Amino acid sequence: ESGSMNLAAAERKKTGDLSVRSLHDIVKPEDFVLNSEHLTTVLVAVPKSLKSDFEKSYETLSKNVVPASASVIAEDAEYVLFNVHLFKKNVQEFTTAAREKKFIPREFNYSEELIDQLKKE
Amino acid sequence: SSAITALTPNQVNDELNKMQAFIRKEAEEKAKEIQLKADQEYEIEKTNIVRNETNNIDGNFKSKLKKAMLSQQITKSTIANKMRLKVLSAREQSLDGIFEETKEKLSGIANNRDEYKPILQSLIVEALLKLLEPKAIVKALERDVDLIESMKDDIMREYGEKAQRAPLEEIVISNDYLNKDLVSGGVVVSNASDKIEINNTLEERLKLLSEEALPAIRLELYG
Amino acid sequence: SQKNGIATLLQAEKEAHEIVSKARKYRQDKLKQAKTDAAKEIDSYKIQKDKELKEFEQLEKKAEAGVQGELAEIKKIAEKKKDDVVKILIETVIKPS
C-alpha cells in the first residue's frame, strides 16, 4: 500500500554547513516551545569536536536553562545542530556565552504563523 | 539514555522546581500589586463619585434653605403686624363707643322737654347772634316747632338784649323739617338769601367737639 | 525528559495565569464596589440633608391670642374713665356758649 515510493533517496548539496545554511528544511514545529511567556527555544550549531563539551555544559551557559531540554536536530560533516529551551530574558546571556565556547547560535525568530507555515512541509 | 544532560534526575528536579517556583512567585507579586492598586483606586473613585453628588445636593439644599428662611420670617413679620393692627383697631373701637354712648345720652336729654326747653332756647339764641340778620330762618325737628313757636317772644327778647346793634324783625320757622335720623335736637339757622347757615344741632356740635377732643382723649387714655 | 521538563513549566505558567486572572477579577469587583459603596453613602447623605431641612421647616388665632392680654387692658382703662369723659362731652355740648 504505502510502498512503491523511494525511501532511499539520493540528495545533492543545496546549502552550506549547519552553521550558515537556511534551517526551514531542517527544523520541525515540534522543536520549538510556542506560545509561552517565559519559555523559548534557541538553536545552536556545534562543531563535532565540541559535541561532548556542549552536552555537559549547555545547562550552565546561562541562568534559567531548562535542564535536559537539549536534543540533536541534525548533523553534517562539521557540525551538530542542537535545540535548547530557556527563559527569554536569558537568551542574550546564553548566545554570548555560547559564542565564547566557539559554538554558533543560529538566529531563528520563529512566530506562530512562521511555524504553522512550517507544517506545510 | 535519550536525554542529554550532565545532571542527576534529582538535580534536574531541584533546578526544575527552582524555575517553576520563580514563575509562581513572579505571579504572586504581580497579582499583589494589582490588588493593591485596585484598593487605592477604589478609595479614589468612591470619594470622587460621592463628592460629585454631595456638591449637587449641597447646592439645592442651600437654595431651599434660604427659601424657607425667608418664608419663616415672612410670617414673623405678618403676625407682628396683625398684632399691632388688632391693638390699634381695638383702641378705636373703644373710643368710638365712648362717643356712641355720648350721643345716646344727648337723645335722652332731647326727650326730657323740661330739661330740653332751656337748652333749645340757648341754642336758637346763640345761632341768631352768629347771623345778626334782620330776618332769620329756623329749621327744626317737626316735634319741636310747637315748642319753638311758644318761645319766639322770649327768644326775640333775649336776642335784643344781646344784639341791639343788629335788630331782628321776624323769626321764620321753616316747614322743611330736620331729619329724625340725623338730628335728635337743636336747630339749623340760616339767612333769607340762604348764603349762610349755622348748624346748631346737638349732633353737629358734638361732631365739631370731636375734632379736638378725640385726639385729647386718645392721649390721656392711651399715652 | 526534554518534553517532560517543559510540560512541568508550562503547567506552572498556567497556574500563574490563574493567579493573575483572579487579581484582575478582584480589581473588577473592587471597581463596582466603589460605585456601590458610594451610592449608599449618597442617598444616606440625601435623606440626612432632607431630614435637617424638614426639621427647620416648622395662623391668625396665634396673633390674636398673642395679644389677648392687651385687648383686655384696653377695655379696662375704658370702663373706668368712660363715664367721666362722657359727662364732660355732654356738658360741653349743651352749655349756653
- Residue B187 to residues B27, B41, B105, B177: CA-CA distances in angstroms? 125, 104, 18, 10
CA B108-C86-B200 angle, 5° bins: 60
Domain positions in chain C are 1-97
- Is B109 an 8 Å CB contact of chain C? yes
Residue whose cell numbers read 569536536: A49
Helix axes C70-94, B202-221, angle to 10 degrees: 140
Q: Please, what is the end-to-end C-alpha distance for chain A in angstroms?
A: 22
- Residue B105 to residues B100, B138, B212, C75: CA-CA distances in angstroms? 9, 24, 20, 20
CA distance B107 to B201: 11
Residues of C in contact with A66 (CB under 8 A): 5-6, 9
Q: Which experimental approach was used here?
A: X-ray
Counted residue by residue, chain B has a size of 223
Taking a C-beta distance cutoff of 8 angstroms, is the pair A32, A115 a contact? yes
Q: What are the helix (H) ranges across chain A?
A: 51-55, 91-100
Taking a C-beta distance cutoff of 8 angstroms, is the pair A57, A101 a contact? yes
Helices (H) and strands (E) in chain A, counts: 2, 4
Which CATH number do you get for residue A71?
Answer: 3.30.70.100
Taking a C-beta distance cutoff of 8 angstroms, is the pair A84, A70 a contact? yes
Strands A104-106 and A39-47: what pairing?
Answer: antiparallel
For the range C54-57, what are the long-range contacts, defined as Cβ-Cβ under 8 Å and sequence gap of 24 or more? Answer: C56/B65, C56/B68, C56/B69, C56/B72, C57/B68
Q: Other C-beta atoms within 10 Å of B156: how many? A: 17
- Residue B161 to residues B70, B151, B187, B200: CA-CA distances in angstroms? 76, 16, 21, 21
Residues of C in contact with A38 (CB under 8 A): 9, 13
Taking a C-beta distance cutoff of 8 angstroms, is the pair B164, B200 a contact? no
Query: B45-83: b or e for each residue (b if 16 or more CB lie within 10 Å)?
Result: bbeebbeebeeebeeeeeeeeeeeeeeeeeeeeebeebb
Q: Which of residues 21-60 of A touch C (CB under 8 A)?
A: 33, 36-39
CA distance B120 to B155: 10
All chains having 3 or more CB pairs closer than 8 angstroms to chain C: A, B
C-alpha B207: how far from chain center: 27
**Sign of the alpha-carbon dihedral angle for B123, B129, B131, B136:** positive
CA distance C66 to C71: 10
Nearest-CA distance from B165 to chain C in Å? 20
DSSP state of A48: G
Q: Which of A35, B38, A21 is nearest to C26 (CA)?
A: B38
Phi and psi of B45, rounded to 5°? -70, -40
Strands B186-191 and B197-201: what pairing?
Answer: antiparallel
All chains having 3 or more CB pairs closer than 8 angstroms to chain A: B, C
Site from B1, B5, B14 to mutate, A interface, most A CB atoms within 10 angstroms: B5
- Structurally, chain A folds into a number of domains equal to 1
CA distance B36 to B18: 27
Domain positions in chain B are 1-96, 97-223
Residue whose cell numbers read 490588588: B35
CA distance A25 to A12: 14
The beta-carbon neighbor of C9 closest among B20, B109, B217 is B20
CA distance C89 to B99: 9
> Are B35 and C26 inside 8 Å of each other by CB?
yes
For the range B215-220, what are the long-range contacts, defined as Cβ-Cβ under 8 Å and sequence gap of 24 or more? Answer: B217/B95, B217/B98, B217/C85, B218/B91, B218/B95, B220/C81
Q: Is A43 left (phi over 0), alpha (psi -120 to 50) or beta?
A: beta
Q: Which of residues 17-56 of B touch A (CB under 8 A)?
A: 19, 22-23
Under CATH, to which class is C1-97 assigned?
mainly alpha
CA distance A84 to A97: 14
- Is A69 an 8 Å CB contact of chain C? yes
Q: Please name the residue of chain B whose CA is at the shortest distance from the CA of residue A58.
A: B5
- Is B10 an 8 Å CB contact of chain A? no
- Is B64 an 8 Å CB contact of chain C? yes
C-alpha B71: how far from chain center: 19
Residue whose cell numbers read 368712660: C82
CA distance C39 to B146: 101
CATH of domain B97-223: 3.30.2320.30
CA distance C12 to C10: 5
The string of DSSP codes covering B92-107 is HHHHHHHHHHHHHHHH
Instruction: Show the domain range for A47.
Output: 1-121
The angstrom resolution of this structure is 2.9
DSSP state of A26: T
- Is C9 an 8 Å CB contact of chain A? yes
Query: B100-135: b or e for each residue (b if 16 or more CB lie within 10 Å)?
Result: eebbeebeebbeeeeebeebbbbbbbbbbbebebee
> Are B87 and C67 inside 8 Å of each other by CB?
yes
Amino acid at B77: S
Taking a C-beta distance cutoff of 8 angstroms, is the pair B150, B113 a contact? no
Taking a C-beta distance cutoff of 8 angstroms, is the pair A103, A46 a contact? yes
